[PDB]
Tab-separated table of N, CA and C in Angstrom:
chain	number	residue	atom	x	y	z
A	1	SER	N	-17.210	-3.688	-0.676
A	1	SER	CA	-15.849	-4.038	-0.220
A	1	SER	C	-15.626	-3.784	1.262
A	2	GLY	N	-15.727	-2.523	1.756
A	2	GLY	CA	-15.546	-2.175	3.098
A	2	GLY	C	-16.391	-3.050	4.037
A	3	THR	N	-15.693	-3.802	4.887
A	3	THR	CA	-16.309	-4.731	5.816
A	3	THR	C	-15.880	-4.388	7.223
A	4	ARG	N	-16.813	-4.524	8.163
A	4	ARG	CA	-16.653	-4.190	9.542
A	4	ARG	C	-16.241	-5.437	10.359
A	5	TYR	N	-15.046	-5.447	10.892
A	5	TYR	CA	-14.557	-6.473	11.829
A	5	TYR	C	-14.628	-6.015	13.220
A	6	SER	N	-15.002	-6.861	14.165
A	6	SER	CA	-15.113	-6.618	15.586
A	6	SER	C	-14.201	-7.548	16.409
A	7	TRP	N	-13.706	-7.103	17.589
A	7	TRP	CA	-12.987	-7.945	18.529
A	7	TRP	C	-13.432	-7.550	19.940
A	8	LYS	N	-13.218	-8.484	20.926
A	8	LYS	CA	-13.386	-8.339	22.311
A	8	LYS	C	-11.978	-8.337	22.938
A	9	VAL	N	-11.571	-7.192	23.611
A	9	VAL	CA	-10.275	-7.134	24.216
A	9	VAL	C	-10.407	-7.185	25.716
A	10	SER	N	-9.266	-7.472	26.434
A	10	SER	CA	-9.174	-7.308	27.868
A	10	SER	C	-7.878	-6.530	28.101
A	11	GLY	N	-7.979	-5.328	28.614
A	11	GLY	CA	-6.843	-4.478	29.099
A	11	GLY	C	-7.033	-3.009	28.653
A	12	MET	N	-7.740	-2.755	27.538
A	12	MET	CA	-7.748	-1.466	26.925
A	12	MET	C	-8.722	-0.517	27.596
A	13	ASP	N	-8.327	0.056	28.682
A	13	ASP	CA	-9.004	1.205	29.288
A	13	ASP	C	-8.034	2.170	29.970
A	14	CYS	N	-7.244	2.852	29.111
A	14	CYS	CA	-6.369	3.940	29.561
A	14	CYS	C	-5.845	4.782	28.382
A	15	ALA	N	-5.631	6.093	28.592
A	15	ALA	CA	-5.400	7.034	27.554
A	15	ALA	C	-4.015	6.992	26.932
A	16	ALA	N	-3.682	5.841	26.307
A	16	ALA	CA	-2.446	5.449	25.668
A	16	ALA	C	-2.620	4.141	24.965
A	17	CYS	N	-3.218	3.169	25.670
A	17	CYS	CA	-3.387	1.827	25.080
A	17	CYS	C	-4.434	1.917	23.987
A	18	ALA	N	-5.383	2.822	24.071
A	18	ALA	CA	-6.260	3.066	22.951
A	18	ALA	C	-5.516	3.415	21.691
A	19	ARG	N	-4.598	4.347	21.780
A	19	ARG	CA	-3.790	4.675	20.656
A	19	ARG	C	-2.979	3.447	20.162
A	20	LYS	N	-2.291	2.827	21.073
A	20	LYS	CA	-1.482	1.644	20.707
A	20	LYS	C	-2.334	0.611	19.983
A	21	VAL	N	-3.573	0.387	20.458
A	21	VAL	CA	-4.566	-0.419	19.744
A	21	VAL	C	-4.780	0.122	18.294
A	22	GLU	N	-5.240	1.343	18.125
A	22	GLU	CA	-5.636	1.786	16.772
A	22	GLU	C	-4.382	1.747	15.907
A	23	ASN	N	-3.266	2.183	16.396
A	23	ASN	CA	-2.001	2.252	15.727
A	23	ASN	C	-1.571	0.804	15.350
A	24	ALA	N	-1.854	-0.194	16.198
A	24	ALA	CA	-1.688	-1.628	15.829
A	24	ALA	C	-2.488	-2.005	14.612
A	25	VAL	N	-3.577	-1.226	14.290
A	25	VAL	CA	-4.382	-1.450	13.114
A	25	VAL	C	-3.898	-0.539	11.928
A	26	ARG	N	-3.646	0.750	12.255
A	26	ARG	CA	-3.351	1.790	11.257
A	26	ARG	C	-2.102	1.401	10.456
A	27	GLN	N	-1.177	0.713	11.124
A	27	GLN	CA	0.038	0.204	10.554
A	27	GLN	C	-0.183	-0.812	9.399
A	28	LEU	N	-1.406	-1.304	9.195
A	28	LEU	CA	-1.699	-2.224	8.100
A	28	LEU	C	-1.737	-1.399	6.815
A	29	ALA	N	-2.855	-1.369	6.093
A	29	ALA	CA	-2.962	-0.728	4.785
A	29	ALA	C	-4.422	-0.762	4.357
A	30	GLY	N	-5.047	-1.915	4.434
A	30	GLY	CA	-6.441	-2.118	3.974
A	30	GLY	C	-7.464	-1.512	4.908
A	31	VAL	N	-7.031	-1.271	6.154
A	31	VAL	CA	-7.871	-0.615	7.113
A	31	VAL	C	-8.141	0.816	6.697
A	32	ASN	N	-9.373	1.273	6.793
A	32	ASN	CA	-9.730	2.614	6.354
A	32	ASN	C	-10.739	3.249	7.294
A	33	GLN	N	-10.883	2.750	8.538
A	33	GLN	CA	-11.769	3.270	9.589
A	33	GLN	C	-11.515	2.354	10.748
A	34	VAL	N	-11.534	2.928	11.981
A	34	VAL	CA	-11.260	2.186	13.235
A	34	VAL	C	-12.205	2.717	14.277
A	35	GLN	N	-12.788	1.848	15.118
A	35	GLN	CA	-13.640	2.232	16.245
A	35	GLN	C	-13.202	1.468	17.506
A	36	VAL	N	-12.308	2.159	18.264
A	36	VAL	CA	-11.814	1.749	19.530
A	36	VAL	C	-12.665	2.455	20.560
A	37	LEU	N	-13.520	1.779	21.262
A	37	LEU	CA	-14.390	2.291	22.273
A	37	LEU	C	-13.965	1.781	23.686
A	38	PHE	N	-13.516	2.661	24.553
A	38	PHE	CA	-13.237	2.406	25.964
A	38	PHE	C	-14.505	1.945	26.658
A	39	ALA	N	-14.292	1.454	27.848
A	39	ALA	CA	-15.282	0.903	28.775
A	39	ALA	C	-16.000	-0.338	28.282
A	40	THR	N	-16.463	-0.346	27.028
A	40	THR	CA	-17.000	-1.539	26.401
A	40	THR	C	-15.836	-2.442	26.033
A	41	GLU	N	-14.634	-1.899	25.850
A	41	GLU	CA	-13.390	-2.580	25.628
A	41	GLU	C	-13.547	-3.447	24.364
A	42	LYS	N	-14.279	-2.844	23.389
A	42	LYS	CA	-14.728	-3.500	22.171
A	42	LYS	C	-14.068	-2.781	21.011
A	43	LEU	N	-13.385	-3.580	20.166
A	43	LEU	CA	-12.670	-3.067	19.056
A	43	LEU	C	-13.576	-3.236	17.836
A	44	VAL	N	-13.529	-2.212	16.901
A	44	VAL	CA	-14.000	-2.448	15.555
A	44	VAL	C	-12.939	-1.873	14.602
A	45	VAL	N	-12.809	-2.487	13.441
A	45	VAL	CA	-11.944	-2.114	12.376
A	45	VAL	C	-12.761	-2.273	11.073
A	46	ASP	N	-12.905	-1.195	10.307
A	46	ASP	CA	-13.571	-1.134	9.031
A	46	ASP	C	-12.456	-1.211	7.990
A	47	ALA	N	-12.373	-2.295	7.266
A	47	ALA	CA	-11.266	-2.491	6.277
A	47	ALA	C	-11.843	-3.171	5.024
A	48	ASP	N	-11.325	-2.737	3.864
A	48	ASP	CA	-11.767	-3.300	2.610
A	48	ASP	C	-10.937	-4.523	2.274
A	49	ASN	N	-11.019	-5.525	3.182
A	49	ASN	CA	-10.371	-6.856	3.119
A	49	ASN	C	-10.364	-7.459	4.470
A	50	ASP	N	-10.405	-8.819	4.582
A	50	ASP	CA	-10.165	-9.462	5.903
A	50	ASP	C	-8.684	-9.293	6.214
A	51	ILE	N	-8.424	-8.724	7.414
A	51	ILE	CA	-7.086	-8.686	7.990
A	51	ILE	C	-7.192	-8.978	9.517
A	52	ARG	N	-8.247	-9.665	9.934
A	52	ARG	CA	-8.551	-9.791	11.355
A	52	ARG	C	-7.417	-10.467	12.056
A	53	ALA	N	-6.952	-11.577	11.504
A	53	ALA	CA	-5.769	-12.251	12.057
A	53	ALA	C	-4.536	-11.295	12.150
A	54	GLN	N	-4.480	-10.350	11.209
A	54	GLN	CA	-3.382	-9.450	11.198
A	54	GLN	C	-3.535	-8.440	12.346
A	55	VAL	N	-4.711	-7.904	12.534
A	55	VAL	CA	-4.937	-6.964	13.594
A	55	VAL	C	-4.749	-7.700	14.941
A	56	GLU	N	-5.303	-8.883	15.109
A	56	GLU	CA	-5.040	-9.723	16.230
A	56	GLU	C	-3.530	-9.842	16.433
A	57	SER	N	-2.775	-10.311	15.507
A	57	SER	CA	-1.326	-10.483	15.649
A	57	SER	C	-0.733	-9.171	16.232
A	58	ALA	N	-1.175	-8.038	15.649
A	58	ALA	CA	-0.731	-6.732	16.081
A	58	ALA	C	-1.058	-6.448	17.558
A	59	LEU	N	-2.288	-6.723	17.953
A	59	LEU	CA	-2.800	-6.457	19.281
A	59	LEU	C	-2.157	-7.360	20.308
A	60	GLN	N	-1.992	-8.626	19.916
A	60	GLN	CA	-1.176	-9.600	20.598
A	60	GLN	C	0.243	-9.010	20.880
A	61	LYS	N	1.001	-8.584	19.800
A	61	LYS	CA	2.306	-8.035	20.062
A	61	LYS	C	2.243	-6.769	20.931
A	62	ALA	N	1.159	-5.974	20.746
A	62	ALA	CA	0.962	-4.743	21.537
A	62	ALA	C	0.712	-5.052	23.027
A	63	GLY	N	0.324	-6.293	23.303
A	63	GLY	CA	0.198	-6.863	24.666
A	63	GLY	C	-1.250	-6.800	25.151
A	64	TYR	N	-2.214	-7.104	24.269
A	64	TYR	CA	-3.646	-7.206	24.611
A	64	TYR	C	-4.154	-8.550	24.117
A	65	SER	N	-4.713	-9.362	25.020
A	65	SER	CA	-5.349	-10.577	24.623
A	65	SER	C	-6.748	-10.240	24.232
A	66	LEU	N	-7.095	-10.421	22.931
A	66	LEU	CA	-8.396	-10.299	22.362
A	66	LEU	C	-8.991	-11.657	22.001
A	67	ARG	N	-10.195	-11.625	21.498
A	67	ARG	CA	-10.844	-12.688	20.794
A	67	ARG	C	-11.413	-12.051	19.539
A	68	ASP	N	-11.105	-12.655	18.355
A	68	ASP	CA	-11.526	-12.205	17.092
A	68	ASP	C	-13.083	-12.442	17.055
A	69	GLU	N	-13.776	-11.324	16.939
A	69	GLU	CA	-15.239	-11.433	16.717
A	69	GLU	C	-15.625	-11.469	15.289
A	70	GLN	N	-16.901	-11.888	15.092
A	70	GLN	CA	-17.521	-11.924	13.790
A	70	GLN	C	-17.629	-10.550	13.127
A	71	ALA	N	-17.993	-10.481	11.885
A	71	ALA	CA	-18.016	-9.249	11.118
A	71	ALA	C	-19.305	-8.441	11.378
A	72	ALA	N	-19.549	-8.161	12.629
A	72	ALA	CA	-20.814	-7.707	13.173
A	72	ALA	C	-21.878	-8.855	12.940
A	73	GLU	N	-21.522	-10.009	13.487
A	73	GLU	CA	-22.193	-11.298	13.141
A	73	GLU	C	-22.003	-11.584	11.638
């Protein structure tokens, strides 16, 4: 069940936007692990369901333009 979703973000390198990112994901439900890595500006979300569009919508409202990546290919 648990599947790993990835995204490419532009903007997330400061000690606040990282939280707003993960919190943009944690506010879901199916998410049960999150990997927000600074400098690489690469998002991962481990969730037992596809919610990538949902996390995107969240990150969009949070004010970060991402691109939905594949599920680790």
